[PDB]
Amino acid sequence: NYYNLRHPKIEDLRDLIALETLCWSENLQVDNEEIYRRIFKIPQGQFILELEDKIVGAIYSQRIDNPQLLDNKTCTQVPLLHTESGVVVQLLAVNILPELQNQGLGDRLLEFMLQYCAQISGVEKVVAVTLCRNYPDYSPMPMAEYIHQKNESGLLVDPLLRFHQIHGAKIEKLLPGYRPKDWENQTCGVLVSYDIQHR
Template identity: 25%
Template sequence: MTLLSTLSPKHSGDKGMEYNLFTLKEHPEMASDFDAMNEAGWPTFMLYDEVAIQYYSQVVEIFPQFQFCIADESGTVMACCNSVPFYWDGTEEGLPAGWDHVFMKSIEDYHQGRVPNTVSALAIVIHPSYRGKGISGIMLDALKGIVKSHSIEQLVAPVRPSSKSKYPLIPMDKYVHWQNDKGDSFDPWIRTHLRAGAKIVKLAPESMKINGTVADWESWTNMKFPESGTYIVPGALVPVTIDVEKNEGRYVEPNVWIQHFI
């Protein structure tokens, strides 16, 4: 974790926790912290999404004001968020197909001169040392603040449910309706969004696609795939399909579109 030498004004979050927020526009030298946080926070295979590999550097360059981290009082980075502005007509049908599509659409809209009216979160990653301390709610509030500061009133996210990987054989359309003993959403990350006033809009059944050779998948998962079939791998929300004859593995991740009201 990096120490931020020059801190921005303090903010107060849940339970009185004080933190400092900075964007890449203010501190471009902190771009490496986003990379380090993503590497620490995601399963290895998630870092090989072809869309992200192609477009991430453009997102950081074009939209630095929508990429932010928070740090504690010592300057230690606790969590980071990537997000992008784009144009959305407000209808369910008009939402991008998912994570990959909104990534590309934000860049396309920018180059075509479309004025954005919506921001989509791409990822909120909390360092393992700070998980379970209410940081997720703080990050959502911070993101809402950034969206509002740019006079944008719509915030959406193709949410990756945090506990879905424990239940990879359960269809997403069933999983999102599970409830805990208190009648709240069973999934912690979905629950955090709903408690913040959001609503579920619809599923994104093909939100992200990751392809690789059999050797790639064996390296990413530290597993062996002796024959073709579907495999449950750590961190995946659904099984991965391996075709040994074609020497390819394919992962199609479903997400859940959630909308916040600014």
């Protein structure tokens, strides 16, 4: 329960690759080179969660000029969009070791990140391209309808979209072809946005 939150160092590389493998299927993982880019080129944009000298989580980001740039892109191209002075922070992933999920860690990490981005000079907006977890249970309902499907009390039915919703995200739109290998979601990412102006 003794947690530390810090920016990554190069030495974290192998543990963060290990975290990537544990958190995502092979088709959904980013490659080792991208983990290295984040920690070498943009350490101020990433946060690592430690539990007694062991990494158990990470939240990642980069800065881009505007969300429209994400249209018609794949996840492997989006690193090329990074700009040092971009007014939009793009959250790239929230990773929590599966054995430690549903303990509020993701919640705390996202909140911290959101607060942190709100005080970065020049940053106007935060967005993320996330994805559904349970679309195969609802197929063939169109994904464009599914991503807004709320139960009777109003939380989104999809647990990954709900996570963003409960932290103040607005579901913007589908991004077809964002993840060519994500066949359960028919390649589609989901763009969400955070209004950070109150922060």
